Amino acid sequence: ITSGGEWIDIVRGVDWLESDLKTSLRDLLINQKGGKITYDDTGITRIRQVIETSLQRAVNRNFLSSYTVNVPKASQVALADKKARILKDVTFAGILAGAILDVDLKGTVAYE
Amino acid sequence: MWNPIVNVDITLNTAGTTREGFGLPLFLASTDNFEERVRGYTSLTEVAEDFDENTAAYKAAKQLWSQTPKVTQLYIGRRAMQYTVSIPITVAAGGGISQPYQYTAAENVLQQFKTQIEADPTIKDKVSVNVTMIITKAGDNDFVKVTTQTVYIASTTADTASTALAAIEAYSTDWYFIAAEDRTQQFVLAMASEIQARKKIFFTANSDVTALQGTELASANDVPAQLAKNMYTRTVCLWHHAAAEDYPEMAYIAYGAPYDAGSIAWGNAQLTGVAASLQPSNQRPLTSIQKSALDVRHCNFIDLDGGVPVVRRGITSGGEWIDIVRGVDWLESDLKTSLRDLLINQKGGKITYDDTGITRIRQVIETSLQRAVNRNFLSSYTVNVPKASQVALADKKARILKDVTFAGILAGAILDVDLKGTVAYE
Amino acid sequence: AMYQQYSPKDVVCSWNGIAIEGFAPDSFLRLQRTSPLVTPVVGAGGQVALTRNADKTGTIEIELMQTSLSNQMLSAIQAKQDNMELEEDISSNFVIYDPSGSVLATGINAWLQELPQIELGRDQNSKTWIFGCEKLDYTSTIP
Amino acid sequence: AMYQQYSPKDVVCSWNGIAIEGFAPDSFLRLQRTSPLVTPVVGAGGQVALTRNADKTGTIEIELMQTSLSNQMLSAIQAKQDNMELEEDISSNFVIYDPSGSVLATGINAWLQELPQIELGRDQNSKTWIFGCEKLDYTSTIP
Amino acid sequence: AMYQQYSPKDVVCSWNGIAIEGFAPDSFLRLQRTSPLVTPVVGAGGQVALTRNADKTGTIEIELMQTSLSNQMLSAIQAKQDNMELEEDISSNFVIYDPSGSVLATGINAWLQELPQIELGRDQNSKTWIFGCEKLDYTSTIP
Amino acid sequence: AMYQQYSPKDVVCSWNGIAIEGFAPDSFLRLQRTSPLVTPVVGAGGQVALTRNADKTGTIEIELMQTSLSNQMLSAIQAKQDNMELEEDISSNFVIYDPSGSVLATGINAWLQELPQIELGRDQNSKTWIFGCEKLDYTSTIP
């Protein structure tokens, strides 16, 4: 365990998960070599898809067990963001699996 | 600044969702931690900064946010304060004006302090001093504080319910539920009488053991009985042993506040982390006779169906269900907003004083009542309006429309069941 | 009161990072489970015992117009996956966005299963693409 | 924006060096694969494993008018191939030219598989010729 | 009333400290005794005398998917046991956990007896592993 | 998660330096051991003692299409081995390459044991070649 009480496994898994999300979204945003990701619901759903896929990659490892994702509607985004060409308000949640490291045991012996 | 192409801030703190509904809570407490007469917060973390864990203004906020989904916002009001000094200083005023005072080695010392204060040309006019010693408001000052071991200090609320309520309303009118830290018989009754003349709801608790005995309301004279006798339909009273220094009223408020008006029932409510009403003497749940004694007073309580605590009935002191009161208030607000939106936005035109203009108002009133019918709050309604050919000419000069009326019918719900059966070989 | 209104215009499908557009005039989407949830067994005497099937796969059939540009993207994606080692992954979540909530399912680890049949005549004929999924999850907005 | 326009007039089919003309009033061309791309297998516990089929053959059905002159050419070509040794080759690429891009497939090493049924009545009935192909290749204009 | 419901998903097998997973689509487990409990003998005059067999061994056949990862573990375990002295023990209890109680037996001192046959085709074929046991014990929840 | 995907296309067999190709439509490969690993013995009193068989030979049956060109190579190889002295070696390792890991065995010192039966009809019939091996070794990727 770390000095803060958190298992090393949790810390390292969270860091890897962040790195995987960062790489997947980077690969989506790059490689638009001749097109756009328009600032409407069609473009937002494409980002939802990659976030969900990258979280499913973690669920497959048995690191997580379930997750959820929420994204904003393109019809209610402030116009400052549309000029800055940035997307905000994306969030997600997850749940951890766990493991076993110790055992407690009791028994009895008798003639009957 | 430079921002990464993808930014990811992952954390380990679980979080829950909030919700928005009709009405927001306000907690009126005796405090001096800020100058404004009303200040808002959005989470318990913000409340912890201004207040310590042992203050009632913190317990009330802690109870409120225990329920799920959360309430969006919470307001805290400040009561007027008076300070007292004795012999077993620093004086502050609105605007950050502070002046220290000192005398070196009791009436002589108190008079020395009084003379120093009354001689100071900066802070004296905003406060008052009198001989123990007493310090109160003066002039425009709405805030005053005294702090300081050869001198002792004390504090006490120095206003009535009427004055505090008026002073807080003259600052912020955005709140529906109101609860109070003070639980004395006089203040509670005064606040109940004041809120009756307003479209607000006053939640209060009680732990008076004299309320658990006697079924005749005529002879009883505790606070719940007096509230019931006055038919204060806008007052909700809850009986709970821990009402001495804890505030379950806020949990009860948060139970139904997050939801829409007129579409829920406040009875049989389940509150998280709140124990049942226990007899103070032996810490056992109330007997049926004590529950009946509370019932005749129109006072609520936390019952046990056998393994689960649930607030029962959920009625105001006047006998009217909380749901009806809140739904009627929401309906009025909706009508007020819809007609306001019609009357405004005539930016370049008129609503002529003839039948063509009157039918347009009929239309919006009907639509706003249909909005309530869709919630299953009402079941049917009717509207009547005057003819433009028979309106008095004084109204046409005043540019006002009168004689509009409507009616509605309520839906209802089910909260209890009665059952009978038989068993036989045949 | 009346229920929420359906609108085909505000339905968006996505898979493998691309958006699928150009829905056909009729029946442009279908979702279905492969097996039922329960399978009763009845003895000669009338007793009943229930079997709870573990299979949860499904199929997603999306149908597009004849000249839609999304047909080229899927063909180009399929051509790439034929020249990849077995160790490389080919599955991705099939996400459907519908503000009316008339679609209750999403495809977990979906793959491309079949190619459209091509027919030509005096008029335009649609093209059907078929997908699979490891688990066709039915969810809802909790009341 | 709107997609590209379809035009039956500008569709040309070719095979064995001849051009096939005289399309029927309706449904004059069909293309289809013999087997799907993937075949899932589900265990009793719900696990999934995918089988990737190697078969890629297909069929091309082209339908012509009753009195079209292209019927004679195909009969004459078929008659020649019956009197050829097995060592001689009988397959050729089936090329379809379509400027609208509504057809995404071409036939690699196609052969003649069936002869049309002949029917006569008060009106004219079409004649269907069926071909095979070693590999029905789906291609696209790379976006 | 109706009996308890069967669920293949909640069946777990274990042996040698590892968990065996990836059950085949059908008939993934079988248990059987080697000999019957009694063997009657009838004389020429009709008299009957009963012989009570002492044998209680059995066989446990567990069948898995073609690409299941539990196949590698069993091969790796078998490879180790071939390079061990005869004095070292190779038997272990075969424990089956089933919340529905449809399986009434457990394997005492089970050993690996046979290796799966391997076959390949267009589709996936299962692999059967066979075990023995000193005493196939039938137990029940005492009414 | 889901297991690895099987693909008949990426399976390669080799023996005697040549590659064997042209697999039949179904069941083109089979592997099997000659004898089981253990043979229990039970006394009249119920005691059990285990016999560990030393035999580890096996058989590899590979089945090919009727007109596959790999049939000629095997016939040509067999013809050579009939005109060789007994001192010359005729065995070689039978190596199977499968990226999915669905085949767990390899043939050590395999030999040609039988020739295919030949049958002709309206359609094409497959041809089965049978091999032996000194030791059919089961291996795995160590977890």
mmCIF file of N, CA and C in Angstrom, chain E residues 55-140:
data_model
loop_
_atom_site.group_PDB
_atom_site.id
_atom_site.type_symbol
_atom_site.label_atom_id
_atom_site.label_comp_id
_atom_site.label_asym_id
_atom_site.label_seq_id
_atom_site.Cartn_x
_atom_site.Cartn_y
_atom_site.Cartn_z
ATOM 1 N N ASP E 55 -16.916 -51.268 -5.217
ATOM 2 C CA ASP E 55 -16.342 -50.249 -6.084
ATOM 3 C C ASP E 55 -17.180 -48.977 -6.048
ATOM 4 N N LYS E 56 -16.500 -47.830 -5.951
ATOM 5 C CA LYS E 56 -17.188 -46.546 -5.919
ATOM 6 C C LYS E 56 -16.491 -45.482 -6.759
ATOM 7 N N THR E 57 -15.559 -45.860 -7.628
ATOM 8 C CA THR E 57 -14.886 -44.887 -8.472
ATOM 9 C C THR E 57 -15.860 -44.323 -9.506
ATOM 10 N N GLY E 58 -15.381 -43.349 -10.267
ATOM 11 C CA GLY E 58 -16.219 -42.722 -11.266
ATOM 12 C C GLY E 58 -15.388 -41.952 -12.266
ATOM 13 N N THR E 59 -16.081 -41.181 -13.099
ATOM 14 C CA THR E 59 -15.454 -40.367 -14.130
ATOM 15 C C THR E 59 -16.156 -39.019 -14.215
ATOM 16 N N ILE E 60 -15.380 -37.967 -14.459
ATOM 17 C CA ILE E 60 -15.897 -36.613 -14.628
ATOM 18 C C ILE E 60 -15.401 -36.091 -15.968
ATOM 19 N N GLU E 61 -16.323 -35.878 -16.901
ATOM 20 C CA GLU E 61 -16.004 -35.362 -18.224
ATOM 21 C C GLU E 61 -16.467 -33.917 -18.324
ATOM 22 N N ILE E 62 -15.519 -33.004 -18.516
ATOM 23 C CA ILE E 62 -15.804 -31.582 -18.659
ATOM 24 C C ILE E 62 -15.355 -31.141 -20.044
ATOM 25 N N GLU E 63 -16.232 -30.426 -20.746
ATOM 26 C CA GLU E 63 -16.016 -30.081 -22.143
ATOM 27 C C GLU E 63 -16.014 -28.566 -22.283
ATOM 28 N N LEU E 64 -15.025 -28.040 -23.007
ATOM 29 C CA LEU E 64 -14.763 -26.610 -23.072
ATOM 30 C C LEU E 64 -14.746 -26.142 -24.519
ATOM 31 N N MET E 65 -14.724 -24.823 -24.699
ATOM 32 C CA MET E 65 -14.715 -24.248 -26.035
ATOM 33 C C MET E 65 -13.352 -24.434 -26.688
ATOM 34 N N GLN E 66 -13.310 -24.231 -28.007
ATOM 35 C CA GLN E 66 -12.085 -24.479 -28.759
ATOM 36 C C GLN E 66 -10.956 -23.548 -28.344
ATOM 37 N N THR E 67 -11.245 -22.257 -28.174
ATOM 38 C CA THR E 67 -10.223 -21.259 -27.876
ATOM 39 C C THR E 67 -10.242 -20.815 -26.419
ATOM 40 N N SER E 68 -10.877 -21.579 -25.535
ATOM 41 C CA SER E 68 -10.900 -21.221 -24.124
ATOM 42 C C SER E 68 -9.485 -21.190 -23.563
ATOM 43 N N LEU E 69 -9.239 -20.254 -22.646
ATOM 44 C CA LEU E 69 -7.915 -20.130 -22.049
ATOM 45 C C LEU E 69 -7.648 -21.205 -21.006
ATOM 46 N N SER E 70 -8.688 -21.884 -20.518
ATOM 47 C CA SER E 70 -8.487 -22.965 -19.560
ATOM 48 C C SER E 70 -7.828 -24.180 -20.196
ATOM 49 N N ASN E 71 -7.811 -24.262 -21.527
ATOM 50 C CA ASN E 71 -7.116 -25.359 -22.188
ATOM 51 C C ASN E 71 -5.611 -25.261 -21.975
ATOM 52 N N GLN E 72 -5.067 -24.044 -22.015
ATOM 53 C CA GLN E 72 -3.634 -23.865 -21.806
ATOM 54 C C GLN E 72 -3.220 -24.261 -20.393
ATOM 55 N N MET E 73 -4.024 -23.901 -19.390
ATOM 56 C CA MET E 73 -3.673 -24.206 -18.007
ATOM 57 C C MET E 73 -3.596 -25.708 -17.777
ATOM 58 N N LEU E 74 -4.561 -26.458 -18.310
ATOM 59 C CA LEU E 74 -4.550 -27.903 -18.115
ATOM 60 C C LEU E 74 -3.378 -28.559 -18.833
ATOM 61 N N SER E 75 -3.035 -28.086 -20.032
ATOM 62 C CA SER E 75 -1.860 -28.616 -20.717
ATOM 63 C C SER E 75 -0.590 -28.331 -19.925
ATOM 64 N N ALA E 76 -0.464 -27.119 -19.387
ATOM 65 C CA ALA E 76 0.686 -26.746 -18.575
ATOM 66 C C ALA E 76 0.784 -27.555 -17.293
ATOM 67 N N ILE E 77 -0.348 -27.870 -16.666
ATOM 68 C CA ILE E 77 -0.395 -28.718 -15.482
ATOM 69 C C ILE E 77 -0.014 -30.155 -15.818
ATOM 70 N N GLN E 78 -0.514 -30.668 -16.942
ATOM 71 C CA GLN E 78 -0.180 -32.026 -17.350
ATOM 72 C C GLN E 78 1.308 -32.156 -17.645
ATOM 73 N N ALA E 79 1.888 -31.148 -18.299
ATOM 74 C CA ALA E 79 3.311 -31.197 -18.611
ATOM 75 C C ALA E 79 4.169 -31.289 -17.356
ATOM 76 N N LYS E 80 3.774 -30.618 -16.274
ATOM 77 C CA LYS E 80 4.532 -30.686 -15.030
ATOM 78 C C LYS E 80 4.481 -32.082 -14.421
ATOM 79 N N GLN E 81 3.303 -32.707 -14.418
ATOM 80 C CA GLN E 81 3.135 -33.989 -13.745
ATOM 81 C C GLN E 81 3.883 -35.121 -14.436
ATOM 82 N N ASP E 82 4.273 -34.948 -15.700
ATOM 83 C CA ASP E 82 5.049 -35.978 -16.379
ATOM 84 C C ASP E 82 6.490 -36.029 -15.893
ATOM 85 N N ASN E 83 6.987 -34.951 -15.286
ATOM 86 C CA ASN E 83 8.365 -34.869 -14.817
ATOM 87 C C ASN E 83 8.437 -34.894 -13.294
ATOM 88 N N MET E 84 7.591 -35.699 -12.660
ATOM 89 C CA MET E 84 7.558 -35.825 -11.211
ATOM 90 C C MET E 84 7.733 -37.285 -10.821
ATOM 91 N N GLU E 85 8.422 -37.504 -9.705
ATOM 92 C CA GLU E 85 8.643 -38.855 -9.216
ATOM 93 C C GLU E 85 7.321 -39.499 -8.812
ATOM 94 N N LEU E 86 7.289 -40.833 -8.859
ATOM 95 C CA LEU E 86 6.073 -41.557 -8.509
ATOM 96 C C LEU E 86 5.630 -41.284 -7.079
ATOM 97 N N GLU E 87 6.562 -40.963 -6.181
ATOM 98 C CA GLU E 87 6.206 -40.708 -4.793
ATOM 99 C C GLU E 87 5.411 -39.422 -4.620
ATOM 100 N N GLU E 88 5.596 -38.445 -5.503
ATOM 101 C CA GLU E 88 4.848 -37.198 -5.427
ATOM 102 C C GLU E 88 3.383 -37.438 -5.767
ATOM 103 N N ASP E 89 2.503 -36.697 -5.100
ATOM 104 C CA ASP E 89 1.070 -36.866 -5.288
ATOM 105 C C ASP E 89 0.578 -36.035 -6.467
ATOM 106 N N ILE E 90 -0.374 -36.594 -7.211
ATOM 107 C CA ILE E 90 -0.950 -35.924 -8.373
ATOM 108 C C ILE E 90 -2.461 -35.780 -8.285
ATOM 109 N N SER E 91 -3.089 -36.224 -7.200
ATOM 110 C CA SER E 91 -4.538 -36.191 -7.088
ATOM 111 C C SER E 91 -4.995 -34.998 -6.251
ATOM 112 N N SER E 92 -6.202 -34.524 -6.553
ATOM 113 C CA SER E 92 -6.797 -33.403 -5.839
ATOM 114 C C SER E 92 -8.309 -33.485 -5.980
ATOM 115 N N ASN E 93 -9.007 -32.913 -5.005
ATOM 116 C CA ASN E 93 -10.463 -32.942 -5.020
ATOM 117 C C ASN E 93 -11.008 -32.083 -6.151
ATOM 118 N N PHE E 94 -11.999 -32.619 -6.860
ATOM 119 C CA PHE E 94 -12.701 -31.901 -7.918
ATOM 120 C C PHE E 94 -14.000 -31.365 -7.329
ATOM 121 N N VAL E 95 -14.064 -30.050 -7.135
ATOM 122 C CA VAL E 95 -15.174 -29.399 -6.448
ATOM 123 C C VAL E 95 -16.024 -28.672 -7.477
ATOM 124 N N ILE E 96 -17.330 -28.926 -7.445
ATOM 125 C CA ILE E 96 -18.297 -28.266 -8.314
ATOM 126 C C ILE E 96 -19.265 -27.489 -7.434
ATOM 127 N N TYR E 97 -19.388 -26.192 -7.695
ATOM 128 C CA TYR E 97 -20.278 -25.308 -6.954
ATOM 129 C C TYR E 97 -21.483 -24.985 -7.825
ATOM 130 N N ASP E 98 -22.672 -25.315 -7.333
ATOM 131 C CA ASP E 98 -23.904 -25.106 -8.078
ATOM 132 C C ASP E 98 -25.006 -24.653 -7.125
ATOM 133 N N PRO E 99 -25.400 -23.375 -7.148
ATOM 134 C CA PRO E 99 -26.408 -22.904 -6.184
ATOM 135 C C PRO E 99 -27.775 -23.547 -6.351
ATOM 136 N N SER E 100 -28.086 -24.110 -7.516
ATOM 137 C CA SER E 100 -29.387 -24.724 -7.748
ATOM 138 C C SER E 100 -29.475 -26.151 -7.225
ATOM 139 N N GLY E 101 -28.348 -26.776 -6.898
ATOM 140 C CA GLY E 101 -28.372 -28.122 -6.364
ATOM 141 C C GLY E 101 -28.727 -29.196 -7.364
ATOM 142 N N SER E 102 -28.561 -28.930 -8.660
ATOM 143 C CA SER E 102 -28.851 -29.937 -9.673
ATOM 144 C C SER E 102 -27.730 -30.956 -9.822
ATOM 145 N N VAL E 103 -26.554 -30.682 -9.265
ATOM 146 C CA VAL E 103 -25.432 -31.615 -9.263
ATOM 147 C C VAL E 103 -25.248 -32.117 -7.839
ATOM 148 N N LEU E 104 -25.261 -33.437 -7.672
ATOM 149 C CA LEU E 104 -25.281 -34.058 -6.355
ATOM 150 C C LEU E 104 -23.967 -34.734 -5.987
ATOM 151 N N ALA E 105 -22.926 -34.602 -6.805
ATOM 152 C CA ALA E 105 -21.722 -35.399 -6.623
ATOM 153 C C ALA E 105 -20.489 -34.507 -6.567
ATOM 154 N N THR E 106 -19.454 -35.025 -5.907
ATOM 155 C CA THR E 106 -18.139 -34.401 -5.853
ATOM 156 C C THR E 106 -17.076 -35.480 -6.008
ATOM 157 N N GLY E 107 -15.943 -35.109 -6.596
ATOM 158 C CA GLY E 107 -14.880 -36.061 -6.858
ATOM 159 C C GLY E 107 -13.796 -36.065 -5.801
ATOM 160 N N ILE E 108 -13.632 -37.191 -5.114
ATOM 161 C CA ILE E 108 -12.614 -37.320 -4.076
ATOM 162 C C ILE E 108 -11.360 -37.922 -4.699
ATOM 163 N N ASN E 109 -10.236 -37.224 -4.564
ATOM 164 C CA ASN E 109 -8.950 -37.684 -5.084
ATOM 165 C C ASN E 109 -9.039 -37.972 -6.585
ATOM 166 N N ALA E 110 -9.350 -36.916 -7.328
ATOM 167 C CA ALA E 110 -9.477 -37.002 -8.774
ATOM 168 C C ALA E 110 -8.124 -36.807 -9.447
ATOM 169 N N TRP E 111 -7.973 -37.419 -10.618
ATOM 170 C CA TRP E 111 -6.755 -37.325 -11.408
ATOM 171 C C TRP E 111 -7.105 -37.101 -12.872
ATOM 172 N N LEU E 112 -6.140 -36.583 -13.626
ATOM 173 C CA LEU E 112 -6.331 -36.385 -15.057
ATOM 174 C C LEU E 112 -6.063 -37.693 -15.789
ATOM 175 N N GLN E 113 -7.025 -38.135 -16.598
ATOM 176 C CA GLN E 113 -6.989 -39.463 -17.199
ATOM 177 C C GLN E 113 -6.785 -39.446 -18.708
ATOM 178 N N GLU E 114 -7.326 -38.456 -19.416
ATOM 179 C CA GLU E 114 -7.208 -38.406 -20.867
ATOM 180 C C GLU E 114 -7.088 -36.962 -21.332
ATOM 181 N N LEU E 115 -6.525 -36.802 -22.531
ATOM 182 C CA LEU E 115 -6.340 -35.517 -23.186
ATOM 183 C C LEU E 115 -7.353 -35.342 -24.314
ATOM 184 N N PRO E 116 -7.709 -34.107 -24.654
ATOM 185 C CA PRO E 116 -8.750 -33.896 -25.663
ATOM 186 C C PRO E 116 -8.291 -34.278 -27.059
ATOM 187 N N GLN E 117 -9.255 -34.688 -27.879
ATOM 188 C CA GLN E 117 -9.011 -34.811 -29.308
ATOM 189 C C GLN E 117 -9.143 -33.443 -29.965
ATOM 190 N N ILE E 118 -8.289 -33.177 -30.949
ATOM 191 C CA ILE E 118 -8.235 -31.885 -31.620
ATOM 192 C C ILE E 118 -8.719 -32.062 -33.051
ATOM 193 N N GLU E 119 -9.728 -31.282 -33.432
ATOM 194 C CA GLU E 119 -10.257 -31.288 -34.787
ATOM 195 C C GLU E 119 -10.493 -29.850 -35.224
ATOM 196 N N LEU E 120 -10.331 -29.592 -36.520
ATOM 197 C CA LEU E 120 -10.490 -28.253 -37.069
ATOM 198 C C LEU E 120 -11.324 -28.318 -38.340
ATOM 199 N N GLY E 121 -12.144 -27.291 -38.551
ATOM 200 C CA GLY E 121 -12.982 -27.207 -39.732
ATOM 201 C C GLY E 121 -13.331 -25.774 -40.077
ATOM 202 N N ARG E 122 -14.507 -25.551 -40.672
ATOM 203 C CA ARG E 122 -14.949 -24.182 -40.913
ATOM 204 C C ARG E 122 -15.405 -23.505 -39.631
ATOM 205 N N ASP E 123 -15.819 -24.281 -38.632
ATOM 206 C CA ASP E 123 -16.368 -23.750 -37.395
ATOM 207 C C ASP E 123 -15.561 -24.290 -36.223
ATOM 208 N N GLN E 124 -16.017 -23.973 -35.015
ATOM 209 C CA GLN E 124 -15.289 -24.282 -33.794
ATOM 210 C C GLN E 124 -15.802 -25.580 -33.187
ATOM 211 N N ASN E 125 -14.876 -26.465 -32.832
ATOM 212 C CA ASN E 125 -15.186 -27.730 -32.186
ATOM 213 C C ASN E 125 -14.687 -27.718 -30.746
ATOM 214 N N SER E 126 -15.441 -28.378 -29.872
ATOM 215 C CA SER E 126 -15.119 -28.383 -28.454
ATOM 216 C C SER E 126 -14.007 -29.384 -28.151
ATOM 217 N N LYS E 127 -13.476 -29.291 -26.931
ATOM 218 C CA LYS E 127 -12.384 -30.137 -26.464
ATOM 219 C C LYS E 127 -12.798 -30.779 -25.148
ATOM 220 N N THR E 128 -12.683 -32.101 -25.066
ATOM 221 C CA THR E 128 -13.148 -32.858 -23.910
ATOM 222 C C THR E 128 -11.966 -33.317 -23.065
ATOM 223 N N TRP E 129 -12.011 -32.995 -21.776
ATOM 224 C CA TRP E 129 -11.051 -33.475 -20.794
ATOM 225 C C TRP E 129 -11.751 -34.450 -19.859
ATOM 226 N N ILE E 130 -11.072 -35.544 -19.526
ATOM 227 C CA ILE E 130 -11.652 -36.625 -18.738
ATOM 228 C C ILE E 130 -10.830 -36.794 -17.470
ATOM 229 N N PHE E 131 -11.518 -36.966 -16.345
ATOM 230 C CA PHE E 131 -10.898 -37.156 -15.045
ATOM 231 C C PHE E 131 -11.448 -38.418 -14.398
ATOM 232 N N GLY E 132 -10.691 -38.954 -13.438
ATOM 233 C CA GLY E 132 -11.147 -40.039 -12.603
ATOM 234 C C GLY E 132 -11.358 -39.545 -11.180
ATOM 235 N N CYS E 133 -11.750 -40.469 -10.310
ATOM 236 C CA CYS E 133 -11.906 -40.152 -8.900
ATOM 237 C C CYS E 133 -11.950 -41.444 -8.100
ATOM 238 N N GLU E 134 -11.326 -41.404 -6.923
ATOM 239 C CA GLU E 134 -11.314 -42.572 -6.051
ATOM 240 C C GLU E 134 -12.721 -42.913 -5.580
ATOM 241 N N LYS E 135 -13.522 -41.893 -5.276
ATOM 242 C CA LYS E 135 -14.867 -42.094 -4.739
ATOM 243 C C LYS E 135 -15.739 -40.923 -5.181
ATOM 244 N N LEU E 136 -16.673 -41.192 -6.090
ATOM 245 C CA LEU E 136 -17.638 -40.187 -6.525
ATOM 246 C C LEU E 136 -18.779 -40.135 -5.516
ATOM 247 N N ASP E 137 -18.705 -39.192 -4.579
ATOM 248 C CA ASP E 137 -19.608 -39.141 -3.435
ATOM 249 C C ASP E 137 -20.873 -38.377 -3.800
ATOM 250 N N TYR E 138 -22.025 -39.010 -3.598
ATOM 251 C CA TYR E 138 -23.319 -38.364 -3.769
ATOM 252 C C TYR E 138 -23.822 -37.887 -2.415
ATOM 253 N N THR E 139 -24.061 -36.583 -2.301
ATOM 254 C CA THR E 139 -24.552 -35.980 -1.073
ATOM 255 C C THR E 139 -25.794 -35.164 -1.387
ATOM 256 N N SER E 140 -26.460 -34.706 -0.332
ATOM 257 C CA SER E 140 -27.671 -33.918 -0.481
ATOM 258 C C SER E 140 -27.842 -33.026 0.736
#
